[PDB]
A = this chain, B = another copy of it.
Amino acid sequence: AIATYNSHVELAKYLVSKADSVYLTIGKSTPWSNETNPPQPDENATVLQEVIGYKKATKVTLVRPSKSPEDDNKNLISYGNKSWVEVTPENAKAEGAKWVYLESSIVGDELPLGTYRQVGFVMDLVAKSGISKFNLVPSEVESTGTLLFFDNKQFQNRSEQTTAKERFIVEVDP
């Protein structure tokens, strides 16, 4: 049996329904063996290496590729040299929206400073019961939930005055 296009939309809708427990995570704060050729990500990982912390996602939405004149009146997202538009879950099937856009920003020392080479997003993260802030180090997390998507990148630095913005667009069934 094959899965249908619209099963991929419904699964994308499901992840977007989890937005309020979705967090960016960053890690790998020491060098790779080859800093210019990061190893290929291993899908069996359940946590980033040398995990630094978590930051609640600022944006979790379905998207689709944009069409130029027609969609020029929407707020277009640029990503991967392509253009994308946001889609509501009510319109996901009609618009064919099987892509999920995920973003967060880490502002200065919201999380310990240093370099990072791994970027991911988790869902179902639960902070310890007395903590309401959106920036969490591992000791402030009650349950890290499920690591959903990640990438191995070349290092970026974070200092007292930097903002690190990270985002993915992903589909069910690549």
Contact = CB atoms under 8 A, between A and B. Distances in A.
B43 A148 contact: no
Contact of A93 (B14, B137, B146, B153): B146
A10 B90 CA distance: 22
Contacts of A113: 88, 90
A32 interface: no
Contacts of A45: 4, 69, 72
Nearest to A90: B109
A100 B170 CA distance: 22
Interface residues of A, number: 76
Contact of A2 (B90, B130, B150): B150
Contacts of A137: 75
Nearest to A126: B70
Contacts of A14: 11, 14
Interface string A80-96: 01000000101101111
6 contacts: A4-B44, A5-B44, A7-B147, A7-B148, A44-B132, A73-B139
